Structure formats: C-alpha cells, structure tokens
Design an enzyme around this catalytic site. Structure first.
Site, mmCIF file in Angstrom:
data_model
loop_
_atom_site.group_PDB
_atom_site.id
_atom_site.type_symbol
_atom_site.label_atom_id
_atom_site.label_comp_id
_atom_site.label_asym_id
_atom_site.label_seq_id
_atom_site.Cartn_x
_atom_site.Cartn_y
_atom_site.Cartn_z
ATOM 1 N N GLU B 357 0.823 -1.205 0.000
ATOM 2 C CA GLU B 357 0.000 0.000 0.000
ATOM 3 C C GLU B 357 0.861 1.260 0.000
ATOM 4 O O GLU B 357 0.611 2.192 -0.774
ATOM 5 C CB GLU B 357 -0.949 -0.013 1.200
ATOM 6 C CG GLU B 357 -1.932 -1.176 1.200
ATOM 7 C CD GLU B 357 -2.916 -1.108 0.049
ATOM 8 O OE1 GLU B 357 -3.328 0.014 -0.315
ATOM 9 O OE2 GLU B 357 -3.276 -2.174 -0.494
ATOM 10 N N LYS B 463 -14.433 -24.607 -19.730
ATOM 11 C CA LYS B 463 -13.845 -25.135 -18.504
ATOM 12 C C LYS B 463 -13.162 -26.475 -18.758
ATOM 13 O O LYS B 463 -12.068 -26.734 -18.242
ATOM 14 C CB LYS B 463 -14.925 -25.286 -17.432
ATOM 15 C CG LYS B 463 -14.878 -24.261 -16.315
ATOM 16 C CD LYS B 463 -15.252 -22.874 -16.792
ATOM 17 C CE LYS B 463 -15.188 -21.891 -15.639
ATOM 18 N NZ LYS B 463 -15.251 -20.478 -16.091
ATOM 19 N N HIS B 487 -16.923 -9.548 -9.061
ATOM 20 C CA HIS B 487 -16.858 -8.385 -9.935
ATOM 21 C C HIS B 487 -17.764 -8.511 -11.153
ATOM 22 O O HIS B 487 -18.061 -7.495 -11.789
ATOM 23 C CB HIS B 487 -15.418 -8.135 -10.379
ATOM 24 C CG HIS B 487 -14.486 -7.845 -9.246
ATOM 25 N ND1 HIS B 487 -14.273 -6.571 -8.766
ATOM 26 C CD2 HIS B 487 -13.707 -8.664 -8.501
ATOM 27 C CE1 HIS B 487 -13.408 -6.617 -7.770
ATOM 28 N NE2 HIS B 487 -13.047 -7.876 -7.589
#
Ligand SMILES: *[C@@H]1O[C@H](CO)[C@@H](O)[C@H](O)[C@H]1NC(C)=O
Ligand SMILES: *[C@@H]1O[C@H](CO)[C@@H](O)[C@H](O)[C@H]1NC(C)=O
Ligand SMILES: *[C@@H]1O[C@H](CO)[C@@H](O)[C@H](O)[C@H]1NC(C)=O
Ligand SMILES: *[C@@H]1O[C@H](CO)[C@@H](O)[C@H](O)[C@H]1NC(C)=O
Ligand SMILES: [Cl-]
Ligand SMILES: [Zn+2]
Lengths: 98, 597
Positions: B357, B463, B487
């Site tokens: 960060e 898949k 998301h």
C-alpha cells in the site's frame, strides 16, 4: 482553519502578461471565444478569480506561506531610510578614535 | 478567441475546482472509513451527489466544444475522458432501470443466502460461512453440496437480470459508438494520434492470444501435478486422466490455488519462511515497519514520505471505540494527501500488505504535480503492477536476511526454493488462464456470438478443455453461474489481473537487469541501487500523460507484452515439474464427468 480559509483571491485569466509593479484590480468578466459577453459570466465567460482556500491537513508544499518582498531604489534624493551604526561602547581617558 | 484557448481555460478551471471538491469527498469518505457514523453517511451522500451533478453538468457543457484537431495531445485525452456521459446519452428511464438492476444484483449478492435442510432456520451466509467451511474442512460431499446449493440459489434467479443487463450495456455502448460493452472496456487501452505506437482494440485480443499460447505449458504442467497429488489424496472421486472437480480449488470460483499448496506441498517437513517469531522478539510495530519501508525507498533514491502522513494518518487500530473497516485501502485525498485503512497485525502478511500500500502511495505522488484527471494510471494495471514489483523486491531472501530479520545462518535451500516458487506459481501464474478464459467468454457474450441457450454449456466446455476442469453435477438452462463471481455482479473487467501480472513480471525483469543481478530472478533484490530507482522514476513521473505502450517501452525497449520474464523466473520450477511429472499423465479429457455411472 479546519473547514477552509476561502478568504484569499487570485487572478489567472488576464488577457496578457502583467507589467511589473502594476495594479490590475477589476471585477470584470473574462471571455473565452468570440461572443461579446455583457457580464452574464455564463458559458465561455468565466470570473477571473478562483478559490484559494487552505486546510491544516494539507501536506508540505501546499500549505499557505505568507511572503513579503521589500522594494529598493537609488533615485537621486536626500537620504530617507538607512541602517544604524555599529555603536561601540564608549571609552574615556584613553587615546582612541571616534 | 481561438477554441484552443477556450478548451485550455475550461480544463484549467475544471482542475482548479475539481481538486478541492474531490478532496472534500475523499475526506468525508475517510472520516466514514475510520468512523462509521450516520452523519458521515449523509456526508458522502451529499458529496457524491454534488460531484456527480457537477461532472455531468460540465460534461454536457463541453459536449458542444468543437474539436478542431488540437495539437499537443494534452487537452484531447482530457476532453474525450470527460465527454463520456455514460447512461445519460439515452433516455433517463433506461438509466434508472439500469441503476435499479445494479442495486438488485448488489443486494442479492450481499444476501446470497444458503441454508441446509437439517437446520433451515440456523444457517450461515456467504461471508464468512462458505469461505471458512471449505477453506479448512476437506469434506468432499459437503463441499460439493455447498457449491451446488450456492449455484442453484444464485443463478436460477440471477439469469434474467444478467441477460437484460448485458443487453442494456451492449445497446448503451452502441449508443456510445461501440460494438459492445466489452469493446467499450477495451477502449481504455486504445491509443490514437501516436504514429508508430497506436494500439488497436483487436490488437489486445491478438496479443493476449500470443501470450497465452506460451503461458499454457506451465499451466498444464501444474494441472497434471495437482491432479496427481489429488489422486494420491482422493483417488475414488477424481479420475487420474480426466479433468479436476471445480469444488476442490480452495475458493468458490477458481481464482486462486494457494489454499491447495498445503495439500500439494513438495516437502511438508522443512520449516517455512517466517519471521513472526522475530516480530515477537523485537516487538516491531507499524511505526518501525514504515521506518524500514522509508529506508528501503531512500536506498533506491526516491524521495521519502511526507511527514504530514506520519502525524495525520492512522497506523494502529483503535479497538472497538470507533467503527472502521479492516480492509486494506489507499486513499488519494489530493493536494498532496494520502491515507491508509488497515488493521495492522504482527505477521509477515501485514508487513507485505503495508509495504504494498505505501508503495502505492509512492507511485501516486510520482505524478503528484500532474493535473487532476491525470492523477492515475493509463489503465487499471500500473498501480497493482508497481505494488507487486516492490512486493517481490521486498520478498526476496537476500532482503529478508540483510535487514536482520532472518539470520544469515539459515540462508536458503533447494527445498525452500521449490516451496516458494510453487507458492508463487499457484498464487499468481494459476490465475491467468481462468481470468483470460472468463474475459473471453464475457467478450463473446457482449459480441452476441453466444446464444442465450448455449451460455452454460459453452462455459462448462471451455472449462473442460481451455481450463481443464469439469462440473460434477449437471446443470440446466435456468442457471446463471457466470454471474456468480464478485466483480461480474459488480460489473468490473477481469483482464486487469492478467495485464497487471504480465506488467509486474516484465518490470521485475527490467528492474533486475537495471540492477545487474545474475542467477535466479526470485533472489533478485533492488535495495541500495540508485540507477534502477532513477530509471523507474523516469517513467513514474509521467503517470498517464503518455500512452501505456510508450511508458512500457521506456525501460524494457519492447513494444508488446512478453512472457519471457515469467519463463526466466520459473525455469527452475519448469525443470522440477518436468523431472517430477515423468511418470505423471499429461492432458485432460473433456468427455469424462464425475457424475457418469
Ligand atoms: C466518531 O464519531 C462519534 C459520533 O459521531 C464521535 O463521538 C467520536 O468522537 C468520533 N471519533 C473520532 C475519533 O473523531
Ligand atoms: C504542450 O503544452 C505544455 C504546457 O501547456 C508545453 O509545456 C509543451 O511544450 C507543449 N507541447 C507541445 C508539443 O506543444
Ligand atoms: C527524508 O529525506 C530528507 C531529505 O534528505 C531528509 O532530510 C530527512 O531526514 C528524511 N526523513 C527521515 C525520517 O529520514
Ligand atoms: C547498500 O549499502 C549498505 C551500507 O554499506 C550495504 O550494507 C548494502 O549491502 C548495500 N546494498 C547492497 C544491495 O549491497
Ligand atoms: Cl465454474
Ligand atoms: Zn494494491
């Protein structure tokens, strides 16, 4: 102040470069384009003054800085303002200089 | 007089008031994030309302400004950035419907309730229920049942809302002069007006294909290794030659395989890399952690952190006195102000997250003098790519021993190298194929080439072969399994992960080359090397004022993303995998299904 010091104003929309030591105080309406705005100060015509507030939370390089400049000149005139003298403490009864 | 000066004045004024307005909004948001109070709720409500209204008003005002081919490519990017009104290009009723559908899906995802028939009243939600249930317990039947029940209770209701959401987004992009919503999202990387470096939207797809065709070999090698390990663990439920089940990947949706490292550890007896004991012994706190972080970035030559951050930000949790979110977030207040939301703990993980960060903040004032709209990256990938390159720089064993946290006598061994590289490959390399495949599926759905009756069947087929994983329970057309993801329901693109990973590996290789390091790339350390820091800063200072391709080419000299740094990084891992899987079957069969009898 914690809320905001929106008490200072500064211009950024002058027509050309300002002459040194020249006052250009005017509550006019700047124009951006070709339409002759008549003081409506709406689109393409903005106020030349912008917000200049400050807060304590601001970091280094953006906090307000009070600045003072002293103007000096050497035009031919009798002396008005100058510095003091060295003022060595007096000595008596001895061969000295004054 | 000329429209050039008109646009310049408009941009200057917009920056001048937008910086302070965004500072107000972000300070309200932070006062909330450290103090969850109703007055703060009203605070960001009013702040966001005013910000949205103001930006929409000036977007409408600037929609009329003539584009007289203005030079310098400076006002242009700004005006095309602020001219995207979004949902207001069409009727406002459709915008309200879109907002209602977004709110509905957000609320349903936040309330994706699943409960067992044994105790219908007493049950657990998605967070943190399933995460802890299946991240620790290995009950095959329970994990399969929970996965199936979650899919049944989500998709069966989420299918329509997702279908009309895709239709609405595609027709809005058509109203936004785009083929579909996927092409709109790919338009972020689009570069125009830069001869010799312009990037096309289909160029991105072709280049991601080119990168994947060389990414694959490590992917099926690790797939074969994990299949062999799970056969050694659970042979009766997993075929040694077929595809894996999708409910034993550690997470709900196959984002990461790090949870399976313990089950597939090459050597479970060698001590792990950890200095939590050193943290306990020396009682280092967040103050000290950021002190050595500042030492790190002074060694590279970059300016150290502003002190106002030291006496203004919060570094230690305040307990239960005030309500705060423990989720790591870095906040750019503007006007040279930066803040952090974290709940620091005494471990290596919080060490790494704090450095990540704080290096985000570092990259953020790398372009501090840049105007307001340009205080960001050219994409959503430079931020996390920089975070990860400095994370890898701080995670090398040489840095760990040199800073005194690890005594040099421990040093490192081949088994520890294998464990560390396997963890890195599972955490980072494994994510790429799945994210790429789901992004390709979303792109095809937006393009409309996938009929609504083929959605899940082609999802599962891709898949089976592209991903190499099968579903153990058949599903019908009522489901909306693709919308299960976080998301996807929050409407965020996923190619950012792949781009960030490629960028971080490329920049790691470039920085190590600038540091003149030899040997393994994981042992490369950037501490006390001014030339690499200055070379990085040369492009860090520009920010997003230049196209992303130009910024990328500044240090590596390559026009396009390449996977060569990743192969160089994982070559020892590749050789170890080749040696180990000599007697292990390679490849997956799509026709095999766990439910077959
Ligand atoms: C958090 O908010 C409450 C109520 O709004 C207030 O009493 C308290 O002092 C605040 N805490 C801080 C650290 O400002
Ligand atoms: C673009 O504008 C900036 C400032 O407005 C100026 O410094 C720069 O020289 C200009 N570049 C070109 C190519 O005109
Ligand atoms: C940060 O860098 C400046 C510039 O050299 C230096 O004077 C200052 O002492 C540094 N701060 C710390 C905490 O070392
Ligand atoms: C940077 O300088 C210190 C001080 O001599 C030294 O101990 C350290 O090893 C140097 N950095 C590297 C990467 O060697
Ligand atoms: Cl799936
Ligand atoms: Zn991050």
């Amino acid at each position: 102040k914690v809320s905001g010091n929106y008490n200072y104003l500064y211009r950024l929309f002058r027509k050309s470069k300002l002459k040194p030591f020249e006052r250009d105080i005017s509550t006019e309406i700047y124009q951006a384009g070709n339409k002759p705005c008549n003081g409506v100060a709406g689109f393409n015509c903005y106020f030349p003054l912008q917000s200049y507030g400050f807060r304590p939370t601001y970091g280094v390089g953006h906090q307000p800085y009070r600045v003072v400049v002293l103007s000096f000149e050497l035009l031919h005139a009798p002396a008005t303002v100058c510095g003091p003298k060295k003022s060595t403490n007096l000595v008596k009864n001895k061969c000295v200089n004054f | 007089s000329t429209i050039e000066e008109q646009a310049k004045t408009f941009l200057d004024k917009f920056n001048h008031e937008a910086e302070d307005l965004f500072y107000q909004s972000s300070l309200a948001s932070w006062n909330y994030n450290t103090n969850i109070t109703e007055e703060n709720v009203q605070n960001m409500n009013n702040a966001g309302d005013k910000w949205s209204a103001f930006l929409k008003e000036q977007s409408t005002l600037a929609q009329m400004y003539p584009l007289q081919e203005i030079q310098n490519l400076t006002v242009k990017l700004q005006l095309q950035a602020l001219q995207q009104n979004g949902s207001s290009v069409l009727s406002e009723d459709k915008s309200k419907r879109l907002n209602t559908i977004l709110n509905t899906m957000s609320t349903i995802y936040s309330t994706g309730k699943v409960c067992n028939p044994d105790n219908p009243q007493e049950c657990l939600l998605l967070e943190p229920g399933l995460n802890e249930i299946m991240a620790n317990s290995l009950d095959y039947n329970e994990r399969l049942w929970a996965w199936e029940s979650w899919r049944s209770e989500v998709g069966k209701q989420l299918r329509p809302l997702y279908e009309e959401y895709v239709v609405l987004k595609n027709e809005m992009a058509r109203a936004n002069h785009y083929e579909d919503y996927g092409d709109y999202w790919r338009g972020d990387y689009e570069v125009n007006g830069v001869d010799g470096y312009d990037y096309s939207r289909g160029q991105l797809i072709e280049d991601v294909e080119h990168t994947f065709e060389e990414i694959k070999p490590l992917y099926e090698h690790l797939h074969a290794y994990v299949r062999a390990k799970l056969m050694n663990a659970y042979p009766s439920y997993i075929s040694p030659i077929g595809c894996l089940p999708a409910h034993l990947l550690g997470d709900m949706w196959g984002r990461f395989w790090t949870n399976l490292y313990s089950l597939t550890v090459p050597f479970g007896q060698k001590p792990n890399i950890d200095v939590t004991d050193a943290m306990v012994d020396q009682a280092w706190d967040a103050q000290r952690i950021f002190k050595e972080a500042e030492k790190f970035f002074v060694s590279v030559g970059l300016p150290n952190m502003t002190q106002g951050f030291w006496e203004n930000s919060m570094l230690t949790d305040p307990g239960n006195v005030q309500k705060a979110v423990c989720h790591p977030t870095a906040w750019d207040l503007g006007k040279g102000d930066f803040r952090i939301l974290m709940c620091t703990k005494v471990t290596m993980d919080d060490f790494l997250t704090a450095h990540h960060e704080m290096g985000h903040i570092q990259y953020d004032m790398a372009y501090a003098a840049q105007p307001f709209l340009l205080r960001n990256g050219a994409n959503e990938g430079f931020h996390e790519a920089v975070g990860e390159i400095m994370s890898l720089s701080a995670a090398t064993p040489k840095h760990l021993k040199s800073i005194g946290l690890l005594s040099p006598d421990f040093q490192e061994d081949n088994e520890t190298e294998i464990n560390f590289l396997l963890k890195q490959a599972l955490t980072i390399v494994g994510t790429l194929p799945f994210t790429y495949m789901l992004e390709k599926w979303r792109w095809m759905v937006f393009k409309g080439e996938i009929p609504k009756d083929q959605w899940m069947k082609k999802w599962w087929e891709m898949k089976r072969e592209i991903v190499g994983v099968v579903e153990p329970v058949p599903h019908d057309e009522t489901y909306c399994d693709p919308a299960s993801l976080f998301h996807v329901s929050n409407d965020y693109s996923f190619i950012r992960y792949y781009t960030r990973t490629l960028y971080q590996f490329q920049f790691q290789e470039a920085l190590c080359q600038a540091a003149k390091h030899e040997g393994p790339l994981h042992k490369c350390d950037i501490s006390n090397s001014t030339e690499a820091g200055q070379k990085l800063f040369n492009m860090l200072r520009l920010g997003k004022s230049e196209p992303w391709t130009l910024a990328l080419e500044n240090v590596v000299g390559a026009k396009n993303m390449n996977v060569r740094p990743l192969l160089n990084y994982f070559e020892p891992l590749f050789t170890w995998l080749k040696d180990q899987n000599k007697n292990s079957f390679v490849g997956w069969s799509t026709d095999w299904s766990p439910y077959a009898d």
